[PDB]
Amino acid sequence: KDRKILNEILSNTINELNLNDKKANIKIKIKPLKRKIASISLTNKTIYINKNILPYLSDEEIRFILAHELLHLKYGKYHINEFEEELLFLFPNKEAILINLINKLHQK
Amino acid sequence: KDRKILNEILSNTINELNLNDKKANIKIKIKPLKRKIASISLTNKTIYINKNILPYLSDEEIRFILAHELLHLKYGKYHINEFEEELLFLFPNKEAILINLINKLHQK
Amino acid sequence: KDRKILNEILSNTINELNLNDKKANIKIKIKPLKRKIASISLTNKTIYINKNILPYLSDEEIRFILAHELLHLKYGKYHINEFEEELLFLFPNKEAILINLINKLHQK
Amino acid sequence: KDRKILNEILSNTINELNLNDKKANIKIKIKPLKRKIASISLTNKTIYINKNILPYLSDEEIRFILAHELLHLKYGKYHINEFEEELLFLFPNKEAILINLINKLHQK
Ligand code: NA
Ligand code: NA
Ligand code: NA
Ligand code: NA
Ligand SMILES: [Zn+2]
Ligand SMILES: [Zn+2]
Ligand SMILES: [Zn+2]
Ligand SMILES: [Zn+2]
């Protein structure tokens, strides 16, 4: 079957969120995943949808899954591993936001 | 202090996601919250930001928090409680999406 | 088929965690669930496992699912709804723990 | 101050869950953490509690945090990275359990 409908979801969701030139050039690819629905690969600059889940997802479900992944991509940052001497990309979460807040209160 | 900057985040994030007329008319209000950063009240048609957290959040943090809440609002649905004889609004999550999939496989 | 093996998991997991007399008297019941694997009903004092998921779960999976639910039951508390004039049971989470911390810093 | 009360929580929580000889020999250490409350290090065989959070946590909070981490440790497994030619430890979650279920339905 065709994945023409999938590249259209990706593109109009990329535009909606207003992704910067670097994060905006991301392709979509159907591949079997061991333990997730979707997965972002920053080295490949692609998002993978689980080959086995996609045939059962509704249009609304796919649109939500993708917009949710890409939102976390949009507000993610790069950090230095130091020990591994490697660049590491970290996605945001409420625990990270709240721990940092309290941490900053304790520097005072 | 002024919350003029907060209503501007809300409005341009509402437009970005393309919220329908009903979900789009949502106001923002600073109020103390017992156990959350933000909280949507569908009867009041307002989103509350924790009075105590907001002074420490960055512009990027607020933009992400709000866009995350509103995304879950956008793809949420109403369901009948039956027992309580009341309307109930349910937000999406990966467990709900995957349980329904398997459930649908078992009707066959 | 028999659910004799299921009541044995429940009982030895209840004992392991050391649940108090009130929370300890909880029965287990196989029932179809709309959007979850397991679900605790405090009025019925029972835990429901999704009829459609259970045939595919391993022994280790069931043991983990149950121990995870019962742990959140063990450290949960009752709170007054005030508006609804009803008792409400709230399960713990990292957001609830961290929001309360910061809230307590702002009373000073 | 003393961390004698912390090693007592760890030990009786290790015994309660019935951790196997390998996972059971785990020490506890107070250290500042960038974005988490607690963190398990399998190479160091230690659990770290955030230096800045711990002074504000209640006895019940600490007991729950630790029992929650150690439960996910207990039902975690090792997997081969293949590409990195390294051993990787993976903690359980409902998405991993449900994705695997559907994946197994598609091998048929
Ligand atoms: Na655009
Ligand atoms: Na618009
Ligand atoms: Na006992
Ligand atoms: Na023991
Ligand atoms: Zn999220
Ligand atoms: Zn979410
Ligand atoms: Zn949990
Ligand atoms: Zn968990």
PDB file of C-alpha atoms in Angstrom, chain D residues 1-15 24-30 45-49 54 59 62-63 66 70:
ATOM      1  CA  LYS D   1      23.552  14.622  59.219  1.00  0.00           C
ATOM      2  CA  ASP D   2      23.261  10.753  59.275  1.00  0.00           C
ATOM      3  CA  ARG D   3      22.012   8.489  56.408  1.00  0.00           C
ATOM      4  CA  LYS D   4      21.574   5.497  58.860  1.00  0.00           C
ATOM      5  CA  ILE D   5      17.738   5.800  58.505  1.00  0.00           C
ATOM      6  CA  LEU D   6      18.090   5.639  54.667  1.00  0.00           C
ATOM      7  CA  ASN D   7      20.043   2.320  54.598  1.00  0.00           C
ATOM      8  CA  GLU D   8      17.290   0.825  56.860  1.00  0.00           C
ATOM      9  CA  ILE D   9      14.537   1.840  54.369  1.00  0.00           C
ATOM     10  CA  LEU D  10      16.580   0.368  51.460  1.00  0.00           C
ATOM     11  CA  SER D  11      17.282  -2.956  53.271  1.00  0.00           C
ATOM     12  CA  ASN D  12      13.706  -3.687  54.499  1.00  0.00           C
ATOM     13  CA  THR D  13      12.282  -2.623  51.047  1.00  0.00           C
ATOM     14  CA  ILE D  14      14.823  -4.997  49.295  1.00  0.00           C
ATOM     15  CA  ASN D  15      13.648  -7.866  51.560  1.00  0.00           C
ATOM     16  CA  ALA D  24      19.765  -7.314  46.053  1.00  0.00           C
ATOM     17  CA  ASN D  25      23.374  -6.103  46.470  1.00  0.00           C
ATOM     18  CA  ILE D  26      22.627  -2.446  45.746  1.00  0.00           C
ATOM     19  CA  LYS D  27      23.873   0.455  47.904  1.00  0.00           C
ATOM     20  CA  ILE D  28      22.184   3.880  48.377  1.00  0.00           C
ATOM     21  CA  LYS D  29      23.992   7.250  47.906  1.00  0.00           C
ATOM     22  CA  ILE D  30      22.978  10.928  48.325  1.00  0.00           C
ATOM     23  CA  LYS D  45      25.269  -1.130  41.596  1.00  0.00           C
ATOM     24  CA  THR D  46      23.906   1.940  43.506  1.00  0.00           C
ATOM     25  CA  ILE D  47      20.719   4.068  43.725  1.00  0.00           C
ATOM     26  CA  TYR D  48      21.167   7.875  43.955  1.00  0.00           C
ATOM     27  CA  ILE D  49      18.696  10.185  45.781  1.00  0.00           C
ATOM     28  CA  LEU D  54      15.605  14.438  50.229  1.00  0.00           C
ATOM     29  CA  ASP D  59       9.247   9.014  55.448  1.00  0.00           C
ATOM     30  CA  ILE D  62      11.054   8.109  50.415  1.00  0.00           C
ATOM     31  CA  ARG D  63       9.630   4.547  51.066  1.00  0.00           C
ATOM     32  CA  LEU D  66      12.532   3.639  46.525  1.00  0.00           C
ATOM     33  CA  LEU D  70      13.417  -1.173  42.973  1.00  0.00           C
TER      34      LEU D  70
END
